[model samples]
Target: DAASDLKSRLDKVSSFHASFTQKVTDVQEGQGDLWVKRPNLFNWHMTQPDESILVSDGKTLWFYNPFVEQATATWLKDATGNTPFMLIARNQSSDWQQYNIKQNGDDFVLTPKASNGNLKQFTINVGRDGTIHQFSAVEQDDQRSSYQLKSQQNGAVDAAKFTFTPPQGVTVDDQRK
Candidate 1:
């Protein structure tokens, strides 16, 4: 059942913090902060604080800032936002197909049914508890980036935390035409 897949994934997650490190891939190494919500809403900020937050209410994906005035969004598309980096925020199953679930040790691996437009391949890592640790992506250009969620502090969050607010003076880019 879809709920089962969602449950297993949600079970591993706890809290996270996003921060920028020297190397883009090593950013998660510096230890950003602790967060309980993945796709946070009204009162949350990314550890990297600069990169945009992508959110969806089973309807659309909105790229926005929690601490600033910038907003850019598009409708959620299958296979498009299925980044190894984002889990609790965007649902790939809502947009793309999932297959090839393989669990080795503490990590559960799955091959996406679609190709990652920017990456040759993507591997998402989650702790034994279900928190996504990091995502290893081999870009089409052969460059590599690892995205990690570091540490989290529980269970699934309430719906209110996924709420979005477009701040005043925020320039929202609507690029889906």
Candidate 2:
């Protein structure tokens, strides 16, 4: 039978926080989450295979790098990579494979197989009920990055509620490069 936990939660909504640490084979230390979600839509805090894009009806997609200024806007990318990037930029499951799809107590550990990716692999720990509870992914070498949900809440508010309007005072960076 389908894992009553993840299978059920997947049928509904899916959302989580990811922390990341990128390590390049030749770099010194690793980089923090290359991607982040900010409910503050105005502030740049998101990225995709493409420039930027709002979902079916999102007003806009924004991205920012502290080293730069101004927010770049573009539609989301359509091409999907065999990398963990899909799990975020796209909604296709074929983009990922379960490494150890087994129950660890009340949690489901989902580790993506190592593909021809620059980064290496990633692990997503879902709750017994299917909501993503935590995650750790890599970029150049390994997510050394993250999907750690300090906490989570499921099924109550509208999906649009996840949308953000960056509060005032937040600095805006641009990535025209």
Candidate 3:
């Protein structure tokens, strides 16, 4: 029941754009804009506390930090399994099977069938219409992060929002090979 319900709810959302505030346990808090599209497209841009960005343009994944003037690029195929974003950005049933979903009222807890080195588990709160309200995750090191989303709009997002161009003078470490 939890599996089917989770799938049905997620299937209603093709894409979404939202502004979010992220709080990391005993660490730092940041605010950002997030955009996600199905079949692998995601962008998370942080504006406060420090400026940073994580973008996946279907093929390449880029992480840029203007504060540090550095960027890293990796192949999207190699980056998918380790992040919670993949849970929303990918729609394949096989992919969903990798995680077990258990519902507790409004929250759906997702735990990987096999342990992933980076992420332990995550919880997602979704509205009846499939708009994601909140997301929280615990990392392998026992650190936790929670994101509260506001002004959420669910539908087709602009393709350009998923692309990333490194700023001038920033060093890039390309690992797509």
Candidate 4:
């Protein structure tokens, strides 16, 4: 009942924006502002230590490294093997069937029915007001990334945040066929 309710609540959100700090163990892999819009759009801007961005506009994904001035484009579905985007991109109730969801204490945990990808499980900690508070993922190799969210607001984010266009003089690597 709890998992189903959580699914329903999550399914209702069209978009969300939050500031997060992610750690891949001792390495600060991602410290960024994250935005997710509907069925498949995700945009993350990592602004600390280095500058990089990953944006998926449902059909296409753009990975940009500002220091290098090169942007890589690929298909979103093909690129979300074991990342957090795989979960946010598919938030529909039916889309959640492939995973086992349960509540542990105050957190909701999701484990894939088949452990095929590099991500094994993830947990969500939602506030009583029904907004996401924080979450974390455990990779297959046991590496974990934990996130603490701030300034979380949910609504329909502007489409401009999802679509990405290469800036002038930047090299574009199109990997989508």
Q: Once model 3 is optimally superposed onto the true structure by TM-score, how far is the C-alpha of residue 8 displaced, in angstroms? A: 4.0
Top candidate by lDDT? 3
Any runs in candidate 1 off by more than 4 Å, and if so which?
A: 1-7, 10-50, 65-69, 77-79, 91-103, 108-116, 156-160, 175-177
State the TM-score for model 1. 0.57
- Model 2, 21-48: lDDT tens digits are 3333323333323222322221112232
Best by TM-score: 3
Tens digits of lDDT, candidate 3, 48-90: 4467788899899898888898999998777654545455555
Off by over 4 Å in 2: 1-8, 14-61, 77-89, 97-116, 156-177
Task: Give the poorly placed runs of model 3, Cα more than 4 Å off.
Answer: 47-51, 90-95
Clashes (backbone N, CA, C under 3 Å), per candidate, total 14, 24, 0, 0
Candidate 3 lDDT at 117 equals 56
Worst 10 residues of 1 by lDDT: 17-26
Judge candidate 3 against the unseen true structure and give its global Cα lDDT, from 0 to 1.
0.76
Give all TM-scores, in the order shown: 0.57, 0.47, 0.82, 0.76
lDDT of each model, Cα atoms only? 0.48, 0.40, 0.76, 0.73
After the best TM-score superposition of candidate 3, give how far the Cα of residue 145 lies from its true spot, in angstroms.
0.5
Worst 10 residues of 2 by lDDT: 35-44
Worst 10 residues of 4 by lDDT: 80-89
